[PDB]
RNA sequence: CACAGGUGGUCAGGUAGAGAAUACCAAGGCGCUUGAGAGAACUCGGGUGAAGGAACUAGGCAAAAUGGUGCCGUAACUUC
RNA sequence: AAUUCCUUGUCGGGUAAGUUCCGACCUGCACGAAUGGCGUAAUGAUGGCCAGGCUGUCUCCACCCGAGACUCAGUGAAAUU
RNA sequence: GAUGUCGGCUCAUCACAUCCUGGGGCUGAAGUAGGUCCCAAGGGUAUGGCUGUUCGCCAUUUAAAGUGGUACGCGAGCUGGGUUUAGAACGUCGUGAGACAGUUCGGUCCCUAUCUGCCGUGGGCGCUGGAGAACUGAGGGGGGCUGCUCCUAGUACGAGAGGACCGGAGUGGACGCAUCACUGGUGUUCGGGUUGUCAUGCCAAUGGCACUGCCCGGUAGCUAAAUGCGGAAGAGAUAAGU
RNA sequence: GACGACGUUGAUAGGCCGGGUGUGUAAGCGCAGCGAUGCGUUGAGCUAACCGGUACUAAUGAACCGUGAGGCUUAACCU
């Protein structure tokens, strides 16, 4: 979906259940198939499995559908195993089990303007001057821990999305602080404002 | 279901009803006294009395129209000449019904119907 | 008797008499909710049900290659003026057979009177 | 307050200034005269007995003649009772006019609907006619099944089948009144009321909102 | 009226010629479609070069009815032929660029101004 | 209101930067209105903003619009101001729907 | 059974019709050994029906529809 | 397949949607060459499918015309118990 | 010693282990929308293609297209498609007669209601002199469904997208009641056109028959597809809960 | 069955008059045309169940059933 641009709804990693397939009833009554389960996902997410995992597919445009786990096959009843050899089939086949899969979703920032500055710079307070987002602002280093979004709408027709990024220190290059991993949410912004 | 409906069926279709009334209407005026069942007599007045009223005025058109009913020239001949002057000074009620009990064959309500004076 | 009191007191006394099968212009009042304007409707009348205040007549129009039939109430205030240009010559009260035959093959005649 | 009792004379449309046609029912109401007034001490409930129209002297028998003479009222077609509304009062012999319906703007009409005689299941209870083809034999408008197998072993009360339909008291609620006439004694009510032309109707102010 | 499995003409130049009203929208047990209604149609005859193809399923708006349209003064608006305007499935907007034939005023009441505006009649 | 709503609508549309304002005096060709105004919209959001602006000012003026159509889709939205229909549509919609016929 | 069944041969009018079909009649013979009422549900035999036209149903079952003469014209296939 | 349990085999046509039908593949439980194999014009009160007209088959039944049903008069059963 | 079976149609009723509407608790409940659990049976709870199918898959709606009982409800209510006596054929088995929880084509569904039951409608008597009316109400029955739009409000919430609770007003779907004022249907009792034939002595003009001979309209009545109304608000005591 | 209205001191039903409705220019006469046919008389004739009036006809004087003051005890008043 184009509307979504965050994964806050999947940071609690709920267990999504596709209902048990209806058991075959007597008198040649075929059970109903379980209804499909659709999970709302933003555009641009990366799909990774745990254990020999690969990128199954990349979200491209709105409405694109990706198959992640195919449902189990139905269990054939005794009607399907009658022949001349055996005329009263007592054998029953269990339905093939569903796919138990671990999914990792990686999303990059969709903002148009990205900020990079020292913790002493007013990156967070600049969002307040350009938008109404209310991030945490204070007089101490590393006030913000995760990137936050903001939209600058001065006119109804035209607007752009600007995101503030947590500050980085002299030693952030090699690590030992917050690292350089929060610059991964870049290369998508059209312009990178520097404070 | 007979709401504001008139016209009895008499266990006959439209063709038989029209012919039976036509034959009975000519017979009644020819003799001035006939004996028939109560329902037949009561619906006969809705035939002969309009015919007499038409016969009150004598014209080539009326006689031809009167000939279209009862399909008999002699009946038309007696009308416009005999029953015309007698009923000229009368406004309706040319016929009256006299109940006379029941038949011995089928036990049906029997009644005579005749003209007003009959000149007898 | 009692009904006829409301019948007479509500009918219009300026209704023209038009024969079935004539070409009639009907001026109706159409409302958009703000302004009242007159809409014309030209066609040949095919059926008249003249019964007291409930009198009505059916007129037919061939517009854009499609036949449209519309009824009007002779005593309703929705109509404004009824006029006749050409008087048809048909010996039938109802002109329902015009629906089947095409207009070019259904040219009506004038009464010449 | 109370209502009136009258006779339906027919139905007619009403044309408004904007062209909208309102189909109304014309009800004539004669000036009802109160024959009795009831009290808690005697009957335990408050009501007034009224009459309308006129009845022939020969047809009127002595018992009701004394009933009319006691109240000083002439003969009437019938008698009815209307329940009072805890504060309104009427006196014996007072004539009831129609102009009191100039503010109710909502009336309830009760009357005996048309008699349709012995009606079938399809006509009365709006059942579904079975198929007229595909081998169907002597069963088109029949009701069909009328119960389950021997476990109930009976037919429940209130089961829908053929019977006498109509010719019973029917109430139509929340009927708009269009116009009321005093000098002509006419009441114009929007919509259709139960009963045939000439039948007696009872009109009352609406009880619902 | 207009019900399912009904042959329908077209009042626009989208490209279809004959469609099938095969499902009427509005609620459960919907029996009929009036003069202004949303119905589901399938294309039964269309121009090969038109904007729509054969067998497509989409939404349509009734324009003209055989039975007629009841005016508040006991006046009916009859027609010779049943016609509709084709609409997109997701958004109820006209597909054709023109309307051919007369259109009743009732579409104005139900806020269908696209058909009324570009219709050279009532 | 007559001959004054013509200038009132043009002022309101031009107040929000409408482009290529055209007024069609359809006195008798159309049986629903007296005049028509067609205006262009730069983008999808602009078309909705123009439509909301003209409707909102009309309510304050004293005329309630009879309805609008192009709400979900901003390709073409219409406003019914009684005797006047005002169309505001995108750049593409003014050629697919050629409104020079009336 | 005074039974809506079955039983061979001969005579073969007029009109319209190709005709022993069919419709009305001629000569001739009959009104079919229970009638009289009212016009409830429902059953049977029929007529018509707004809009849709098989959406009914196992199934276009039944109904509905076509139906004649003259002229023009008439496909795949084929043992021509 | 009049022959296939697995089977609604797989693909395509027809339909918005086709366990039926038609066209290709052969994994023929369990076709097969006078207990004849394949094709075949015409024919069929033969089986299956689709299209056009037509319609109360249906949505959804309504009214009407006759014969019973109902009442009166006369005659007057039956199964079952 | 016997049609009696599955499916479909008509008609339903009951239970709640509740599909929707109703009232809530928790939430990994920002909002809309969801997850789970409790109370709640008043009402409602789809149309088609395939197959005989119940069941299913598919297409498209709805708030939902609930789960079960009632001889897997209902054939002295209907259907006879499935299966299936007598015919025939294919595959297989057996030398064969024949057979096959293998397939294919065709193949009689009777009953006038005695009793209980139910739907309506009467007679007798009683209610303590008789009679004519009009009512209170002990009790019983019917109905109780809900979509969409607007204001509140683009407000609360939300960075934006998106988008409220409560309350109020309209407008629809299905169901029921009533009516014929309008639109229609029917209207073999009204008028007219027309074919064949016979009759009225003949022309003209009519009548009989041919499905009302075939048609065109159409009075009243009846009727729906037509138009009016209704589902309540409120009061008392409560379930879960606060 | 039953319910409702009326029975001469009556509009209950039928008939009649007027009106409405429906159909559509009746028959006859003469003219034009050889004829079919059209024209003026003419929106004529006819018109069921619908509306308003009208005793012209049918709802007869009657007779039948249904009674003659309505049980006992006690309680509150009236003599
Ligand atoms: N007067 C003034 N003070 C400012 C301005 N900008 C920042 N400051 C002050 O300097 C402080 C810097 O903190 P802040 O802006 O929150 O830093 P930050 O953008 O959050 N960076 P980080 O997330 O890494 O901590 C502010 O809290 C405020 O007190 C400015 O324009 N004017
Ligand atoms: Mg910061
Ligand atoms: Mg504004
Ligand atoms: Mg919007
Ligand atoms: Mg917004
Ligand atoms: Mg909104």
Calpha distance F50→D25 (Å, rounded):
51
- For strand C36-49 and strand C23-31, is the pairing parallel, antiparallel, or unpaired? antiparallel
Calpha distance B11→B16 (Å, rounded):
10
Which subunits have 3 or more CB–CB pairs within 8 Å of chain B? D
The 10 Å Cβ neighbour count of residue A86 is 11
What are phi and psi for residue F84, nearest 5 degrees? -130, 130
Long-range contacts of D67-73 (CB under 8 A, 24+ apart): D67/D35, D68/D35, D71/D33, D71/D34, D71/D35, D71/D36, D73/D33, D73/D34, D73/D35
- What letter would DSSP give residue D68? H
Which are the contacts of D75, defined by CB distance < 8 A and separation ≥ 6? D54, D55, D56, D57, D60, D64, D65, D68
- Measured between CA atoms, how close is D197 to chain B, in angstroms? 12
Calpha distance C73→A18 (Å, rounded):
64
In Å, what is the CA distance from C56 to each residue of B31, C44, C72, C73? Answer: 51, 14, 6, 5
Long-range contacts of C92-98 (CB under 8 A, 24+ apart): C92/C20, C92/C21, C93/C20, C93/C47, C93/C48, C94/C20, C94/C46, C94/C47, C95/C20, C95/C21, C95/C44, C95/C45, C95/C46, C95/C47, C95/C60, C96/C46, C96/C47, C98/C44, C98/C46, C98/C60
How far does the CA of D62 sit from the C1' of I130, in Å?
A: 14
C-alpha dihedral over E116, E118, F1, F2, to 10 degrees?
-150
Bridge partners of residue E6, in order along the sequence: E21
The token pair at E18 is 């004959």
The token pair at A154 is 């001065």
Bridge partners of residue C71, in order along the sequence: C58
C-alpha dihedral over D18, D21, D22, D23, to 10 degrees?
170
Residue D169 belongs to what H/E stretch? strand D169-175
Domain boundaries, chain B: 13-115
Domain that holds residue F21: 1-102
Calpha distance A99→F46 (Å, rounded):
48
Which are the contacts of D137, defined by CB distance < 8 A and separation ≥ 6? none
* CB-count burial class (<10 Å; 0-12, 13-18, 19+) for A143: middle
The token pair at B72 is 């008999």
Q: In this structure, are residues A185 and A114 in contact, taking their beta carbons and an 8 Å threshold? A: yes
Bridge partners of residue B115, in order along the sequence: B95
Q: Which of C42, C58, C39, C46 is nearest to C106 (CA)?
A: C46
Q: Which of A60, A29, A30 is nearest to A45 (CA)?
A: A60
| Alpha-helical segments (H) within A46-174 | 123-130
Q: Which residues line ligand 1 (CB under 6 A)?
A: A 119, 121-125, 137-139, 141-144, 166-167
Q: Which of D108, D103, D106, D49 is nearest to D79 (CA)?
A: D49
Q: In this structure, are residues E86 and E52 in contact, taking their beta carbons and an 8 Å threshold? A: yes
The DSSP string of C39-63 is EEEEEEEEEEE--GGG-EEEEEEEE
In Å, what is the CA distance from A104 to each residue of A16, A68, A114, A129, D151? Answer: 14, 12, 25, 36, 60
Q: In this structure, are residues D176 and D24 in contact, taking their beta carbons and an 8 Å threshold? A: no
Calpha distance F53→F4 (Å, rounded):
18
Calpha distance B48→B25 (Å, rounded):
6
CB of A157 within 8 Å of any CB in chain F?
Answer: yes
- For strand A46-49 and strand A103-106, is the pairing parallel, antiparallel, or unpaired? antiparallel
Task: Mutate one of C64, C74, C78, C101 to test the E interface: name it (highest E CB count within 10 A).
Answer: C64
The token pair at D17 is 């200034």
Indicate the resolution in Å: 2.4
Long-range contacts of B57-64 (CB under 8 A, 24+ apart): B58/B84
Long-range contacts of D66-74 (CB under 8 A, 24+ apart): D67/D35, D68/D35, D71/D33, D71/D34, D71/D35, D71/D36, D73/D33, D73/D34, D73/D35, D74/D33
For Cα atoms D119, D125, D131, give the angle at the middle one, nearest 5 degrees. Answer: 90
Could you identify the residue written with the tokens 């019948």?
C7
Bridge partners of residue C84, in order along the sequence: C24
Q: In this structure, are residues B59 and B79 in contact, taking their beta carbons and an 8 Å threshold? A: no
Phi-psi region of B101 (alpha: psi -120 to 50; beta: other; left: phi over 0): left
Q: In this structure, are residues A47 and A56 in contact, taking their beta carbons and an 8 Å threshold? A: yes
In chain A, which ranges are E strands? Answer: 46-49, 103-106, 113-116, 151-152, 160-163, 191-194
* CB-count burial class (<10 Å; 0-12, 13-18, 19+) for E97: middle
The 10 Å Cβ neighbour count of residue C67 is 17
Q: In this structure, are residues C59 and C43 in contact, taking their beta carbons and an 8 Å threshold? A: yes
Q: In this structure, are residues D53 and D80 in contact, taking their beta carbons and an 8 Å threshold? A: no
Bridge partners of residue C31, in order along the sequence: C36
Calpha distance B60→B65 (Å, rounded):
9
Long-range contacts of F80-83 (CB under 8 A, 24+ apart): F80/E108, F80/E111, F80/E113, F81/F5, F81/F9, F82/C32, F82/C33, F82/C34, F82/C35, F83/C32, F83/C34, F83/C35, F83/F2, F83/F5, F83/F33, F83/F34, F83/F35
In Å, what is the CA distance from D189 to each residue of C8, C59, D193? Answer: 19, 32, 9
Q: In this structure, are residues D157 and D104 in contact, taking their beta carbons and an 8 Å threshold? A: no
Q: Which of A188, A3, A41, A4 is nearest to A108 (CA)?
A: A188
Calpha distance D6→D43 (Å, rounded):
27
Q: In this structure, are residues E53 and E46 in contact, taking their beta carbons and an 8 Å threshold? A: yes
What are phi and psi for residue E100, nearest 5 degrees? -110, 110
How far does the CA of A85 sit from the C1' of I92, in Å?
A: 12
In this complex, the answer to whether residue B120 has its CB under 7 A from any atom of chain G, a nucleic strand, is: no
- Shortest-distance nucleotide from B96 CA to C1': J57
- What letter would DSSP give residue D150? T
The DSSP string of chain E is -B-SSEEEEESB-SSEEEEEEEEE-SSTT---B-SS-EEEEEEEEE-TTSSS-TT-EEEEEEEE-SS--B-TTS-BEEESS-EEEEE-SSS--B-SS-B-S---THHHHTT-HHHHHT-S--
SS3 D201: strand
Which are the contacts of E99, defined by CB distance < 8 A and separation ≥ 6? E11, E12, E63, E85, E115, E118, E119, E120
The DSSP string of chain B is --SS-----TT--HHHHHHHHHHHHHHHHHHSEEEEEHHHHHHHHHHHHHHHHHHTS--HHHHHHHHHTTT-HHHHHHTTTTHHHHTTT--S--EEEEEEEE-TTT--EEEEEEES-TT-
Q: In this structure, are residues A161 and A112 in contact, taking their beta carbons and an 8 Å threshold? A: yes
Please list every residue in chain C whose beta carbon sits closer than 8 Å to the beta carbon of residue F66: 32-33
The 10 Å Cβ neighbour count of residue F94 is 19
Question: CA D120, D126, D132, D137 torsion: positive or negative?
Answer: negative
Q: Total domain count for chain F?
A: 1
Could you identify the residue written with the tokens 């006419």?
D186
- Measured between CA atoms, how close is D57 to chain C, in angstroms? 26
Closest-CA residue of chain F to E97 = F97
In Å, what is the CA distance from E10 to each residue of B105, E3, E41? Answer: 74, 16, 11
Could you identify the residue written with the tokens 């299941």?
D121
Between chains, do B3 and D114 touch, taking CB under 8 Å as contact? yes
- Solved using: cryo-EM
Calpha distance D194→D171 (Å, rounded):
8
Question: Which of F78, F98, F101 lies nearest to residue E113, judging by beta carbons?
Answer: F78
- What letter would DSSP give residue A66? -
Calpha distance A102→A155 (Å, rounded):
44
First and final C-alpha spacing in chain F: 23
In Å, what is the CA distance from B120 to each residue of B82, B115, C44? Answer: 14, 11, 64
Q: Which of F44, F42, F49, F48 is nearest to F16 (CA)?
A: F49
Calpha distance C110→C14 (Å, rounded):
25
Calpha distance A6→A41 (Å, rounded):
9
How far does the CA of B112 sit from the C1' of G71, in Å?
A: 70
| Residue at the smallest CA–C1' distance to nucleotide I48 | E22
């Amino acid at each position: 979906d184009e509307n979504l641009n965050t994964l806050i709804d999947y940071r609690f990693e709920k267990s999504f259940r596709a209902e048990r397939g209806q058991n075959g009833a007597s008198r040649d009554c075929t059970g109903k198939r379980g209804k499909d389960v659709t999970i709302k996902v933003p555009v641009g997410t990366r799909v990774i499995d745990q254990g020999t995992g690969e990128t199954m597919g990349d979200m491209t445009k709105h409405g694109q559908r990706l198959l992640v786990a195919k449902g189990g096959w139905h269990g054939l009843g005794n009607t399907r195993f009658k022949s001349s050899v055996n005329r009263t089939p007592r054998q029953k086949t269990n339905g093939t089990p569903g796919d138990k899969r671990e999914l990792l979703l990686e999303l990059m920032l969709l903002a148009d303007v990205g900020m990079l500055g020292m913790p002493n710079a007013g990156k967070s307070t600049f969002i307040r001057a350009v938008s109404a987002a209310k991030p945490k602002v204070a007089d101490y280093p590393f006030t913000t821990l995760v990137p936050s979004l903001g939209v600058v709408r001065m006119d109804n027709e035209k607007s752009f999305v600007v995101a503030d990024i947590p500050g980085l220190i002299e030693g952030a290059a090699e690590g030992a602080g917050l690292g350089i991993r929060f610059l991964k949410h870049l290369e998508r912004c059209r312009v990178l404002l520097h404070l | 279901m007979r709401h504001r409906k008139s016209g009895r069926q008499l266990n006959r279709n439209s063709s038989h009803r029209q012919a039976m009334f036509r034959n009975m209407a000519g017979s009644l005026v020819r003799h001035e006294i006939i004996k028939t069942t109560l329902p037949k007599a009561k619906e006969l007045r809705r035939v002969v009395e309009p015919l007499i009223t038409l016969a009150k005025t004598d014209s080539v058109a009326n006689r031809r129209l009167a000939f279209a009913r009862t399909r008999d020239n002699e009946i038309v001949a007696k009308l416009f000449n005999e029953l015309g002057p007698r009923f000229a000074s009368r406004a309706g009620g040319y016929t009256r019904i006299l109940k006379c009990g029941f038949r011995a064959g089928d036990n049906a309500p029997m009644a005579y119907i005749e003209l007003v004076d009959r000149s007898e | 008797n009692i009904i006829k009191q409301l019948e007479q007191e509500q009918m219009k006394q300026d209704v023209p008499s038009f024969r079935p099968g004539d070409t009639v212009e009907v001026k109706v009042w159409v409302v958009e909710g703000s302004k009242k304007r007159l809409q014309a409707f030209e066609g040949v009348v095919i059926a008249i049900r003249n019964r007291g205040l409930h009198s009505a007549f059916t007129v037919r129009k061939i517009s854009n290659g499609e036949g449209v039939e519309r009824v009007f109430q002779t005593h309703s205030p929705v109509v404004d003026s009824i006029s006749v240009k050409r008087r048809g010559a048909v010996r039938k009260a109802k002109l329902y057979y015009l629906r089947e035959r095409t207009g070019k093959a259904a040219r009506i005649k004038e009464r010449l009177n | 307050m109370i209502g009136l009792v009258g006779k339906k004379v027919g139905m007619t449309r009403i044309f408004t200034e904007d062209g909208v046609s309102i189909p109304v029912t014309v009800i004539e109401v004669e000036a009802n005269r109160v024959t009795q007034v009831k009290d808690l001490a005697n009957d335990g409930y408050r009501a007034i007995q009224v009459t309308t129209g006129a009845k022939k002297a020969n047809r009127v028998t002595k018992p009701e003649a004394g009933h009319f003479a006691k109240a000083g009222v002439e003969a009437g077609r019938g008698l009815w009772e209307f329940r009072l509304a805890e504060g309104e009062e009427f006196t014996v012999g007072q004539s009831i006019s129609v102009e009191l319906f100039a503010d109710v703007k909502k009336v309830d009409v009760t009357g005996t609907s048309k008699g349709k005689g012995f009606a079938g299941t399809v006509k009365r209870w709006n059942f579904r006619t079975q198929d007229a083809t595909h081998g169907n034999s002597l069963s088109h408008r029949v009701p069909g099944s009328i119960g389950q197998n021997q476990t109930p072993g009976k037919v429940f009360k209130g089961k829908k089948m053929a019977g006498q339909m109509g010719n019973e008291r029917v109430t139509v609620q929340s009927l708009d009144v269009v116009r009321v006439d005093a000098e002509r004694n006419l009441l114009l009510v929007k919509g259709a009321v139960p009963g045939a032309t000439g039948s007696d109707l009872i009109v009352k102010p609406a009880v619902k909102a | 009226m207009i019900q399912e499995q009904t042959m329908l003409n077209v009042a626009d130049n989208s490209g279809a010629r004959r469609v099938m009203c095969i499902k009427v929208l509005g609620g459960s047990h919907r029996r009929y479609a009036g003069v202004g209604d949303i119905i589901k149609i399938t294309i039964k005859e269309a121009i090969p070069r038109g904007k729509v193809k054969k067998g497509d399923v989409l939404k349509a708006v009734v324009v003209r009815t055989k039975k007629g349209v009841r005016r508040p003064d006991g006046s009916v608006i009859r027609f010779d032929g049943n016609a509709c305007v084709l609409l997109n499935n997701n958004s109820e907007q006209p597909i054709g660029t023109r309307i051919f034939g007369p259109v009743t005023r009732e579409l104005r009441s139900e806020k269908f101004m696209k058909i009324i505006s570009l219709a050279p009649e009532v | 209101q007559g001959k004054a709503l013509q200038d009132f609508v043009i002022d309101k549309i031009d107040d929000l930067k409408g482009q290529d304002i055209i007024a069609l005096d359809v006195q008798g060709k159309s049986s629903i209105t007296d005049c028509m105004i067609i205006c262009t919209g730069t983008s999808s959001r602009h078309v909705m903003s123009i439509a909301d602006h003209v409707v909102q000012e009309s309510r304050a003026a004293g005329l309630l619009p009879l309805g609008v159509e192009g709400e979900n889709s901003a390709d073409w939205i219409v406003v019914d101001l009684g005797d006047v229909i005002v169309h505001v549509m995108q750049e593409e919609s003014r050629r697919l729907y050629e409104l020079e016929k009336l």
